[PDB]
Amino acid sequence: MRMQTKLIHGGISEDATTGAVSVPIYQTSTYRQDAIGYEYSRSGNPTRFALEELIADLEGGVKGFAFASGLAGIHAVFSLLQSGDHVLLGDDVYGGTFRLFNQVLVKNGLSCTIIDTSDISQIKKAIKPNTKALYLETPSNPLLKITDLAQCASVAKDHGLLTIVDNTFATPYYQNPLLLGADIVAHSGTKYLGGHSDVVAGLVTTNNEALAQEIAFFQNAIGGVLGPQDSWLLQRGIKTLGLRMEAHQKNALCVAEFLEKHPKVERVYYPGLPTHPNYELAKKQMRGFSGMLSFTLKNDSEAVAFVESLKLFILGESLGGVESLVGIPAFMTAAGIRDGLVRLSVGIEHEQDLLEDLEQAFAKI
Amino acid sequence: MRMQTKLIHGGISEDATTGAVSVPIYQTSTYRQDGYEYSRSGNPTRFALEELIADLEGGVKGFAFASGLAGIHAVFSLLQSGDHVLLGDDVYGGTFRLFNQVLVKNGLSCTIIDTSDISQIKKAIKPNTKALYLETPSNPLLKITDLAQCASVAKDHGLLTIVDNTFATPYYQNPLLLGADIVAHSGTKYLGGHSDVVAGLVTTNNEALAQEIAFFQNAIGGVLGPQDSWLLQRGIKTLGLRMEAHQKNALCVAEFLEKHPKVERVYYPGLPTHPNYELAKKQMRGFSGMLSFTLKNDSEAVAFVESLKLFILGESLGGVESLVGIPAFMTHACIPKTQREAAGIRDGLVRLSVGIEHEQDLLEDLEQAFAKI
Amino acid sequence: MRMQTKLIHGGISEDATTGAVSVPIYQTSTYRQDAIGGYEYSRSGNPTRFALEELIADLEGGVKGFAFASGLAGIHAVFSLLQSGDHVLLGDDVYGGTFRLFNQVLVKNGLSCTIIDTSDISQIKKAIKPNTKALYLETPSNPLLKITDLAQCASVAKDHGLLTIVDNTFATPYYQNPLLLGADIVAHSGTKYLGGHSDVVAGLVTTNNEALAQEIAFFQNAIGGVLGPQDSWLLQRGIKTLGLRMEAHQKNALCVAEFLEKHPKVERVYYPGLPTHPNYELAKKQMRGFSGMLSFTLKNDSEAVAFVESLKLFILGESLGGVESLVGIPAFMAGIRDGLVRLSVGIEHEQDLLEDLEQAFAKIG
Numbered sequence A: 001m002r003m004q005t006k007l008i009h010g011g012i013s014e015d016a017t018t019g020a021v022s023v024p025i026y027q028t029s030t031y032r033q034d035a036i037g038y039e040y041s042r043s044g045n046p047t048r049f050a051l052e053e054l055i056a057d058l059e060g061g062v063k064g065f066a067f068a069s070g071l072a073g074i075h076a077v078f079s080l081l082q083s084g085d086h087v088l089l090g091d092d093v094y095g096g097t098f099r100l101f102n103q104v105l106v107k108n109g110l111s112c113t114i115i116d117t118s119d120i121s122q123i124k125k126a127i128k129p130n131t132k133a134l135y136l137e138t139p140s141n142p143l144l145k146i147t148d149l150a151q152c153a154s155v156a157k158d159h160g161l162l163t164i165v166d167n168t169f170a171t172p173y174y175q176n177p178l179l180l181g182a183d184i185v186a187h188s189g190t191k192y193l194g195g196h197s198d199v200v201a202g203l204v205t206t207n208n209e210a211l212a213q214e215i216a217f218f219q220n221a222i223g224g225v226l227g228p229q230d231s232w233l234l235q236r237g238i239k240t241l242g243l244r245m246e247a248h249q250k251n252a253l254c255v256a257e258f259l260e261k262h263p264k265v266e267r268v269y270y271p272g273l274p275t276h277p278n279y280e281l282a283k284k285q286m287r288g289f290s291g292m293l294s295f296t297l298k299n300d301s302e303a304v305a306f307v308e309s310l311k312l313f314i315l316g317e318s319l320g321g322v323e324s325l326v327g328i329p330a331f332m333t334a335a336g337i338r339d340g341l342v343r344l345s346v347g348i349e350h351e352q353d354l355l356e357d358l359e360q361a362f363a364k365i
Numbered sequence B: 001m002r003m004q005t006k007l008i009h010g011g012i013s014e015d016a017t018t019g020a021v022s023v024p025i026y027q028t029s030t031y032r033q034d035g036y037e038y039s040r041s042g043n044p045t046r047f048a049l050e051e052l053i054a055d056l057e058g059g060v061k062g063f064a065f066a067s068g069l070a071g072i073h074a075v076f077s078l079l080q081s082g083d084h085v086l087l088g089d090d091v092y093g094g095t096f097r098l099f100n101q102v103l104v105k106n107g108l109s110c111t112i113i114d115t116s117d118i119s120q121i122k123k124a125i126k127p128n129t130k131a132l133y134l135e136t137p138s139n140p141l142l143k144i145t146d147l148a149q150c151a152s153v154a155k156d157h158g159l160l161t162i163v164d165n166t167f168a169t170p171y172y173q174n175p176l177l178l179g180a181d182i183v184a185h186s187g188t189k190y191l192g193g194h195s196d197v198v199a200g201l202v203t204t205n206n207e208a209l210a211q212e213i214a215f216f217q218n219a220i221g222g223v224l225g226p227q228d229s230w231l232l233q234r235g236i237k238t239l240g241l242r243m244e245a246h247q248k249n250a251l252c253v254a255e256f257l258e259k260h261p262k263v264e265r266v267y268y269p270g271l272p273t274h275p276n277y278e279l280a281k282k283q284m285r286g287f288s289g290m291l292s293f294t295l296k297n298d299s300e301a302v303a304f305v306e307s308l309k310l311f312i313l314g315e316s317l318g319g320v321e322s323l324v325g326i327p328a329f330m331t332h333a334c335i336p337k338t339q340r341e342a343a344g345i346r347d348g349l350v351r352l353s354v355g356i357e358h359e360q361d362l363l364e365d366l367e368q369a370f371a372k373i
Numbered sequence C: 001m002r003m004q005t006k007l008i009h010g011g012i013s014e015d016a017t018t019g020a021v022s023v024p025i026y027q028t029s030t031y032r033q034d035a036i037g038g039y040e041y042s043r044s045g046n047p048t049r050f051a052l053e054e055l056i057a058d059l060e061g062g063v064k065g066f067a068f069a070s071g072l073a074g075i076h077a078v079f080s081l082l083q084s085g086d087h088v089l090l091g092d093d094v095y096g097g098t099f100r101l102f103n104q105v106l107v108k109n110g111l112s113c114t115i116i117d118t119s120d121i122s123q124i125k126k127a128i129k130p131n132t133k134a135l136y137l138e139t140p141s142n143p144l145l146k147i148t149d150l151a152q153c154a155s156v157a158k159d160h161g162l163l164t165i166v167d168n169t170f171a172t173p174y175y176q177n178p179l180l181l182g183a184d185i186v187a188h189s190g191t192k193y194l195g196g197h198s199d200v201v202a203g204l205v206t207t208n209n210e211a212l213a214q215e216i217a218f219f220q221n222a223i224g225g226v227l228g229p230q231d232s233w234l235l236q237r238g239i240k241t242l243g244l245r246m247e248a249h250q251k252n253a254l255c256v257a258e259f260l261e262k263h264p265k266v267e268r269v270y271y272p273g274l275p276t277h278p279n280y281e282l283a284k285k286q287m288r289g290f291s292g293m294l295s296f297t298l299k300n301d302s303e304a305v306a307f308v309e310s311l312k313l314f315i316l317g318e319s320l321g322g323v324e325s326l327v328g329i330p331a332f333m334a335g336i337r338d339g340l341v342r343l344s345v346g347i348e349h350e351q352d353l354l355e356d357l358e359q360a361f362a363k364i365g
C-alpha cells in the first residue's frame, strides 16, 4: 500500500475480534489477568496502541508513543539525558520548547546553545565535549526557515549525537526525518495531525530499538500519556491527512502569491515561494509545503487593525486545523520577528473566500 | 568429479550403514557411549553439510552456524583484543554492525576502505592489523575486488584474507583457490535457495585455523540444527541449475534495463560496460542473479517498486523468488541521506534479486511498472 | 650557558679571524672563489645573516635559523613547502596579515584553511581532513591574548601526519620555547620584540628537523625574501638586550593590567599575567613569563578613540614590541569590539605610564 492507503489501513485500523472497521475506544484502567505473573492503561491501552502503531507506520519508525500534549512528548524525549548534558537548539524554536529547556530541563542539569540550524557551520562551531543531542525544527515557527536535515543528521551522526526533529508543520505526509538520518521524530498532534482543532496530543516515534525502550520507559514513568478518547479522535483525524494537506498547500500557495504581489505587504514567509531562502533544499527534502505562512506589512503599526478586521480568519492561539487561524507572534507565541509580523494558518475553506477576507481587511488600512 | 556432480555426491551425501541416498536427520542431543558425544560438538546431519561446503570451496573443514552472522562472529572470535581489521566500505550493514556494536566493545578496531583500490588497503595497514575482510561482488553496487591481488598483498603482510562469498556462490567463485584463508557464506541465500532456511557456512584452507573455528563454533554455541543442516544440503543440490537460471535471467534483465529510457545506470558484473568486467571474468566463472539499477528521477523509485506484482517487496535475496528492495529505505534507512549519496546509494537505487521465474514474466512485470511512472 | 648569557654569546657573537666582539657587516653581494667546487652568493649565504640565524636556532633550540625580509615573508616561505590541494588549520584570531596571507595569497595557489578556536583542543580534532598537513598556532594571541596549549595540540597533530607551526612573536624565545613543547616550526616577526627598538623590519624562522631545514632553506633562496646584512646585524644587536627588555616589559605590563582591572571606567582586561584570565594556569605552565602585550575593552565603547587620541606618552602607531609605548585599536588598524584598545607596554618608568593613563581616563564620561 501507498501513503494515502496507509493513512486509512495503516497501524492498527480494525478490531481483529469483531471486524469493526474502527478501533474500539477502550475506556478502561485495568485488565483481568489469567495467571499470577495489557496490565494497566498508563503502560498499555489498545486504543492508544493503535494510534501509536499508525504514527510509527507513517514516519517509518519501530514504535510510536502518544502523549497528553506535544510538550509532554518533547519533555519525555529530553528525559533520555543526564545532568551535565548539552543540547543544540534552533534559534527560532517553538516558544514552549525553549521555555521547557529554560525553566524545566535547566533546573535539572541540562544546558543548551541557541544556534542557526540553516548555518551548518554554526552547529559545528558549537559542539561541546558533553553535547549529546541536536534539536531541529523545519520548517520553523514563525519565519519558516528551512534546515538541511540530511546534512545536520550527518554532522550529528559522526559525532556521537542524537538527531531530534519536531516534524509538526510538514506532516509525515510531506517530510520523513527518519528516512534522512534523524533518530527521533516529535509531533504536536494538536495541530495538523488530528486536524480539527479539537484534540490536544503529542506523538513521538523513532528508528531505533534502544531509544524505543528509553522513550517507552519515560512515557510510562513520568505518566504524560494520551487518553483513549483523544487517541481515537486523533487517529480518526489522521485518516483525512492526505486530503487536508493537499488543500492546505493549495490554499497556502494561493495566499502566499496574493500577499507577495500586494502593495501593502513587504515580506512573505512561505516555503512554497521560489524566492524563499532555501527553496531548492525545501523541494529536495519535502514533498509539499504546508498551510503555514507569516507575512509582514509595510506599515508596521497597522498589524493589530488588519488581524482584527478579518472575519473568516479566526483570531486564535493555535494552528493546523480545517479552520483558518490568524496570529501575531509578538503578542502571542528581535530575530526577524518584527512586531508587525502576522502568521496565518491557512485552512481548508474555499480559496476565493480566504482571498476575499484578506481583501476586505487590507481595504481597511 | 566436476563441480556439478560434486553438488550431488560431494562431502557426505549418503548414509553408509543403511544405503539411504539422503543423510538422515539426527534430531538427537546426545549419544550412547561404550564418534559423536554431544550435538553441539558434533552431529552427523550437520557434519555431512560441513564436509560438502569444505569439499566445494576446496577446504579442509566446514562449519555450519545458526546464521551467516553467527559464522562471521566465530571467525572474528579468533582475534585477541588489540587486533585491527580492514573492512570493505560496502560491507553488509550487519557485518559493519558486528564490529561497530559487538566486537569493538571487545577490543577490536577497524578501518573502512574501498577494496577495489589496492593502494588504499596498503595505506590502511597498521603494525597491529591481523585481518582483511573482503566481499565481491559487493552489495548493492556489485563492485569487484581483485581476490588474488588482495590475498597476496595481505599474505606478504601478516594478514588473514577473509572473504564473504555469498553473492557469487562456490559455483562461480572459489576464494581459497585464489589466496583466501577463510570463506564465509550466508546459507540463508543462494546456498539454501528457497528462502526457507537461516544458516551460516564457514570453510578454510588451514588446519590450524580450522581448530580455532571448531573451538569457537563449540564454545560460543551458535551452531546449526540438524533439520536446517539437512534442508540447506537439499537446497545446495540444485545450486548449479539455479545459478545458471539466476544468471540467465539477470543478464536478460540487466540488458532490458539499459535499453530503458527511464533507467540511468545499471550495476551488474555481467555487463561489458561494468567497471572491472575483465577482472570479473578472471576470478568468476559466472555472475549471480544480483543487480541494482538507478533511475533518472529519484522520487519515481517508490512508485516503480510499489506497482511491481511479480517481484516480491522483501528484505532477503538469493531465493527462487524474485525480490526487490530500495536499499536507501530498507537495508540502509538508518544512514544519513547525504552519507548514502557519498557511498553511491541514491534514493533512486533499486536492488533486484532476480529469481528463477520465466524471464518473460519477469520482464512483463518490469514493463508495466515503468509504464506506470 | 644560560638564556641570559646566550643572548650575548650565542650562535655566532664574535668574528673568528679578527676577534671582533661584534660580527662584521658584510655589505657584499658576491665572493671570490678558488673553485670550481663557504659563501658563494649573498642570497644563498651571507656571514652576517648567518650569525643571526645561528643565534635564533640556538635560542629556540633549533638546528637551523632563517632570516627574512619580514615576519610575513618568513611565514610565507614556511607555507611554501605545501603542494596545492593541501589543508591547514588556523587559529580564529591569528595575526591580521597572517589571515590576509592565506585568504588572498596561498588559497588561490590551491591551499585550503579552516578557522578554529585552538584553545578548544576538541575543535581541532573536529576539523581534521584527510588532506590536512599542518596546524598553525599563535599564543598568546593577537590581540586578545587567548592562550593555546602547545604541548597537547602538538601531540594531537603528532599522532596524525601533521606539522605544528607556531608564531612565537608575542611571548619571545625568552618566555616560551615551542620547539621543546613538540612544535616543528617556530616563526617570529623580528620587527617586534626581537629587534626591540622599532627600527628594523625582519622575520625569523627556525626548526627542530633536519629535513624541514633543507626545505625552508630551499624556499628562502628560491623566493629570495632574505634579510639584508645591516638589518640582520641590527637585529642581532637588538637581541642582546632581549632578556633585560622582556623583564621590564612584563614588570610594566603587570603593573598596568592591575591598574586597568581595578578601574571603574574599564570593562574587561586581557593579559595572561592576570590570575582571573582564561587558562592562566596554562600560561604559567608553558611560559616563563608574560610579555608587554595587553588589551582592554572599556565600559563606554564609543569613547575608545577619544581615549587613545588623548594619550601623551604612549604613541599612537602601527606596531608593537618596542622600547617606546605603542597603542592601537586593532579594529581600525570574534572578540574584537570596535572599542578594544591594544597596548604595547614599553620599558619607560611605570609611574609615567600610569600617569598617562590616569590623565586619559579623566577626560571621558
Ligand SMILES: *Cc1c(COP(=O)(O)O)cnc(C)c1O
Pocket: A069, A070, A071, A072, A094, A096, A166, A168, A169, A187, A188, A189, A190, A191, A200, A201, A202
Ligand atoms: C503547538 C506546538 C507544540 C505544542 O503541543 P501542545 O499540544 O501544545 O503540547 C509543540 N510543537 C510544535 C511545533 C507546536 O507547534
